[model samples]
Target: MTVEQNVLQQSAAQKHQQTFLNQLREITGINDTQILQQALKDSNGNLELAVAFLTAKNAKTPQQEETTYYQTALPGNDRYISVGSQADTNVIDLTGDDKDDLQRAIALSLAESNRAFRETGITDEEQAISRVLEASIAENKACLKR
Candidate 1:
């Protein structure tokens, strides 16, 4: 082939490969260039084979799986707590009378105090919670006494 023809062929090949890569990315939701290239190379530039290879290769192992915990608000002044892969639980009910409100206040106080204590590398969880309770009670003694 002539030099001009070789250049045009190379350009067309690059364009075709780029289009294939784009289609692969859209199919597999893989944006990593190295992974995409490796998948394409492993599958000999076959789209279906590349997708299957990547899907099997990227399957999550037990160690790779992460456990997430989140707190969400539920109906009627209730807070839902999610532990790891478990469903939500109504562990904290902020509804009811004055004492319930006080309990909620105390819980908030403990959370804030524990966060501060954690910054200082506090090791005793119970001690941190107790300290927060004592401080909160002292601060709100008059209101609580009523």
Candidate 2:
């Protein structure tokens, strides 16, 4: 709820949100509204005190998710990213579980899948990953008998 609340919209109540978004941006060094939204409280919000507190709080808390940090590569620039049938978004999420052996197998499978499909086609990360993962496991199991 806290994360989603900050993004501005055309809704009438959003007027306040938009102002706060700018107020936080103008007075502070923040380049993104996410930090502002995370700092904002339920109205009667004080810009000076809140932003000052936010700057310090950001340093200590940081981000809990590695995936969120990875977004900087894509969302940082407001331009057309070449992610379509002709390209892979390349937004790989490394949040998962695996033993050492399985991890290596999965890693190898991806390099093959990663380029094999990207020669000029399309796909979703999860579907593509899972499909490739299962195949890799099966191939490894069958290979052990040889």
Candidate 3:
């Protein structure tokens, strides 16, 4: 309590930040210095928010939130790789052996897709193939039972 001016004393400022990082480690369980620094930088040293951001890093990110709803059924009576109620239609081999499905599925689906292209009046092969492939992938997903 001696008469020492504010600037006269060359003592270190009272700071809890030195302990804050380690304190963050204790709570967040993140001991890595660089990661803490990175989070701190992103948070602009906002110690409070950094922890939530840190934990959320490992969580699954939002995806396929609002996927486009496409007309999956093309409303036709023809041979295809797609699935539907058995009617007056030439349905392709939707059910195949699992032993050699990788090659067999591709062969059947692509061949029928091209055939459907011709039947359905697809003008361009490139466009037809691309569009059919897109549809086929979706078709496969629709048929796939979880």
Candidate 4:
């Protein structure tokens, strides 16, 4: 099958799985998608096993994990953009034809630049920005698919 056809099939499968998860949520009183998906996965799509997984988790008072936030300085500005989670970090606003890839590249670049500044005590703004841009170009090139 063509790539387009494979993508379409995958989309349909995802939609069907989402619908199934929603129905299961209504019946099982479980709201988290990740939890439900994990349960379903462990059970091999068996409803009883899924329910059992939920029951066992509910039996044990689960502890919430602490969240860490990350930030990167905006180019040519003192303002920094905050990334709260992996999901938020993945979505970046940048001027580019390939927005997602560019965003990832820039984010990685900024992170590396920040690390260098923190480690080496580099205080020059221009140098930092230049390093970030250089790293971004390298990252983008390395990530380019054949």
Predicted model with the maximum lDDT: 1
lDDT tens readout by residue for model 3, 1-146: 44323554433452445455654555566546777667666777676666656775543224223222255344577868877756787766776546776789799999988886656465677786788787857356445456
**lDDT (0 to 1) per candidate:** 0.65, 0.62, 0.59, 0.62
TM-score, structure 3 vs. true: 0.27
The local distance difference test score of model 1 is 0.65
lDDT of 2 by residue, 84-111 (tens): 6666566866865446877888899989
Count steric clashes of candidate 2.
0
Best by TM-score: 1
The CA lDDT at 80 in model 2 is: 92
Could you tell which candidate, 2 or 4, scores higher by TM-score?
4
Alpha carbon lDDT of residue 9, candidate 3? Answer: 42
Clashes of each: 0, 0, 0, 0
What is the lDDT ranking, best to worst? Answer: 1, 4, 2, 3
lDDT minimum window of 10 residues, candidate 3: 60-69
Off by over 4 Å in 3: 1-15, 57-146
List model 1 lDDT by residue over 1-146, tens digit each: 22323334456768877878765666665556678778789888798777777676653234322222233222267457855786777687585445677789889999989886647565677787889888867356346445
Itemize residue pairs with steric clashes in candidate 2. none
Better of 1 and 2 by lDDT: 1
Cα displacement (Å) at residue 17, model 2: 1.1
Question: TM-score for model 2?
Answer: 0.28
RMSD of 1: 34.5
lDDT tens string, model 4, 63-104?
Answer: 322222133232366557875555546565575466588689
